[PDB]
From a paper:
In each case, the asymmetry of the homodimer was retained. Crystallization of Mad1CTD‐Bub1CD1 with a twofold higher peptide concentration of 5 mM led to a lower resolution structure most likely due to the twofold increase in DMSO. However, the differential occupancy, although reduced, was still observed in this structure. Thus, this peptide is likely to bind with higher affinity and to represent the single binding peptide in solution as detected by NMR, ITC and AUC analyses. This model is supported by our Mad1CTD‐Bub1CD1 structures from various space groups where higher occupancy of the second Bub1CD1 peptide correlates with a more symmetric Mad1CTD dimer. Alignment of all four Mad1CTD homodimers from the three different space group structures displays the extent of the flexibility within the Mad1CTD coiled‐coil and head domain.
The Mad1‐Mad2 complex, which is required to catalyse MCC formation, is targeted to kinetochores through a direct interaction with the phosphorylated conserved domain 1 (CD1) of Bub1. Mad1CTD is comprised of an N‐terminal elongated coiled‐coil, followed by a globular head domain featuring a conserved RWD (RING, WD40, DEAD) domain. Each monomer contains a long N‐terminal α‐helix (α1) forming the stem, followed by an antiparallel β‐sheet of four β‐strands (β1–4), a short helix (α2) and two C‐terminal helices (α3/α4). Bub1CD1 is largely a single α‐helix, consisting of almost four turns.
Residue numbers in the entry:
A (entry chain B), C (entry chain A): 597 to 718
B (entry chain D), D (entry chain C): 459 to 477
C-alpha cells in the first residue's frame, strides 16, 4: 500500500541515520579515549588481528621495539607475555617483576620509570 | 540542540565506559 | 505483499540488524580493551558524566580511592589533575613526578608500585 | 563463515585501534 511504503521508508532512513550516528560518536569517542590512556599511563595499546596487545612505550628508546602481551582470555584472565625484540633486552626486570612478583603493572611501571630516566637531554 | 539518534547513540556508548 | 514493500521490509531488517550487530561488537570489544588496559597498567580508566577521566589502582587500599584528570584543552594533550580525597594522600608523588618532572606516566608508575607494596602477601 | 553484518561491523571497529 501507499501508506506502508511511505511508512517503511521512514524506518530505513532512521536506521540508516542511526548507523551514521553510531559510527561517528563511537569513532570519536574511542579515539579520544586511547589518547587519555597514552597521555596518562605512557603506553599506547594496539590490538592485533589476533587480539594480542602490543604496547609501545611513550619513552621508548627506539621506535621499533615494543612489548606484546597475548592472552588465552576467553574470560578476563591474565595475559602471558610473548617475546619481542625489545623484550629480550629487558631481562631481570621480568624476572623481578613478572616471574617473581607476578605483577604486570609493576613490571610496566618499573619499566616506564626506567625509560624516563634514560631519556635525557644529553 | 541535540538530535535524537545522536542523543540515543551517545548514551549507549557513554554507558560502555563505566564499571 | 507488494514487491515494492517487500524490498523495504527486507531492507529495513538488515539495516536494523546491521546497527544491531554493530552495537554488539563494541560490547565485546570495548570490554576486552579495558580489562586488558586494567590488568596491564593496573588502572581502571572511566569516563565520567562530566567527561573527565577517573583512575582507580588495581592495588587501591579501599574502593572509591580514585583520581581524576581533566583534559586542559580538547586539542592540547595535557591534563590537569583534579583535587580529590585520595589525591590528598599523595602530596609527595605529585610534587616530584607531576610538577618537578611533568610526567603523568612517572607519577602513576611510581604510585602503582607503592600501592603494590602494601599488599599483605601473611 | 560469519554473518555479513557482523563481518563488516567487525572490520570497522578493528581498524580504530591503530596509530
Amino acid at each position: 500500500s501507499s501508506k506502508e511504503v511511505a511508512e517503511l521508508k521512514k524506518q530505513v532512513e532512521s536506521a540508516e541515520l542511526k548507523n551514521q550516528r553510531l559510527k561517528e560518536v563511537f569513532q570519536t569517542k574511542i579515539q579520544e579515549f586511547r589518547k587519555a590512556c597514552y597521555t596518562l599511563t605512557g603506553y599506547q595499546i594496539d590490538i592485533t588481528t589476533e587480539n594480542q596487545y602490543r604496547l609501545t612505550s611513550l619513552y621508548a628508546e627506539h621506535p621499533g621495539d615494543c612489548l606484546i602481551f597475548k592472552a588465552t582470555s576467553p574470560s578476563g584472565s591474565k595475559m602471558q607475555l610473548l617475546e619481542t625484540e625489545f623484550s629480550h633486552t629487558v631481562g631481570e626486570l621480568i624476572e623481578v617483576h613478572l616471574r617473581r612478583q607476578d605483577s604486570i603493572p609493576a613490571f610496566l611501571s618499573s619499566l616506564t620509570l626506567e625509560l624516563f630516566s634514560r631519556q635525557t637531554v644529553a | 540542540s541535540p538530535t535524537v539518534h545522536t542523543k540515543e547513540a551517545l548514551g549507549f556508548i557513554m554507558n560502555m565506559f563505566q564499571a
